[PDB]
């Protein structure tokens, strides 16, 4: 089983440190293990090294990525590869994909960005300004549906490199994620239960009537009994969540409705119209 590594920080930083330590539990257990460091890579925002990094992750069989913690979440850099993987790992746009080549006589699809994958997180901050990393990691995988084994975070870890038994913690990771690759079919998630049932999010955004899982999209409702929080839902919102393939084809499905809408619309006067008056009333700013 080969381990992939993956870090965002500064060149021989912590996260580099937590994420090696991570890959020598791995070995430990057998795997094979590589590393790439993010800062030796040039990629763009999603309007270049990008597919190299993708062939790398596609080829491992688990994978464990360590961030930095910026503003309480994952770097921009993490959420320029999450954008960057819609395209090409949606699991349920590359099962209509494949589906759709085998029965036109087109051509089949990368196998490999449908396998079956395991990936592990651990979010490294230099403080308790830490509450939205995790829910950012779990969107990388929520795209491809890779099974998190383990989504740690890590508070005030500036010296987290001689804090032993948090680099301890780290190895067990490496540990958990070479032993779920060995058999990724019954491998199952090894880290907080959290509050969302299904997503294992704490992280929900409420109005009225609505509390919604941020990461798996389940809208149901949270209780506060004695100040322990919980989640419910109607069973039927389990069709629709954004982790499953069946609310993925739906969502898709919205798409592709709304996308014929807009291309209609765009011929109407009104959108001509409008557009032209824009186009009129201001240009844009640029340097020189
Ligand atoms: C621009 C910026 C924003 C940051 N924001 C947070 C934060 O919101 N919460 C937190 O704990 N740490 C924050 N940090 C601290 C970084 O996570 C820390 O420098 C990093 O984990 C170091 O890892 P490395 O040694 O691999 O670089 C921030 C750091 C920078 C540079
Ligand atoms: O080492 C840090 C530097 C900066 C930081 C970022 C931009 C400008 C000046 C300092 O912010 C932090 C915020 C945190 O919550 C934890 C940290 O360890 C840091």
Redesign the pocket.
């Known amino acids: 089983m080969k381990i992939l590594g993956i870090s965002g920080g500064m060149r021989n930083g912590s996260n580099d440190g937590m994420c090696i330590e991570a890959l020598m539990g791995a070995k430990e257990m057998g795997a094979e293990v590589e590393f790439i460091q993010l800062q030796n890579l040039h990629i763009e925002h999603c309007t270049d090294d990008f597919d190299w990094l993708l062939d790398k992750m596609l080829d491992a069989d688990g994978i464990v990525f360590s961030t930095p913690?910026?503003?309480?979440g994952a770097t921009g850099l993490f959420h320029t590869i999450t954008d960057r993987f819609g395209p090409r790992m949606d699991r349920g746009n590359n099962i209509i994909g494949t589906k759709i080549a085998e029965e036109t006589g087109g051509t089949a699809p990368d196998p490999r960005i449908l396998k079956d994958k395991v990936i592990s997180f651990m979010s490294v901050?230099?403080?308790?300004?830490?509450t939205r990393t995790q829910c950012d990691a779990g969107m990388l995988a929520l795209t491809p549906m890779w099974k998190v084994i383990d989504n740690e975070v890590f508070p005030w870890?500036?010296s987290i490199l001689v804090e032993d038994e948090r680099v301890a913690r780290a190895h067990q990771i490496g540990r958990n994620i070479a032993e779920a690759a060995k058999d990724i079919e019954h491998a199952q998630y090894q880290g907080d239960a959290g509050v969302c049932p299904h997503c294992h999010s704490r992280n929900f955004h409420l109005q009225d009537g609505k509390a919604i899982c941020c990461l798996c999209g389940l809208e149901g409702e949270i209780h506060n009994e004695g100040g322990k929080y919980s989640f419910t839902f109607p069973a039927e919102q389990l069709e629709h969540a954004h982790d499953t393939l069946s609310g993925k084809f739906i969502h898709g499905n919205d798409i592709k409705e709304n996308t014929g809408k807009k291309i209609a619309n765009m011929q109407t006067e009104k959108y001509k119209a409008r557009q032209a008056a824009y186009r009129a009333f201001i240009t844009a700013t640029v340097p020189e």
Do not use: C
């Open positions: 913690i910026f503003e309480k901050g230099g403080s308790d300004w830490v870890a500036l």
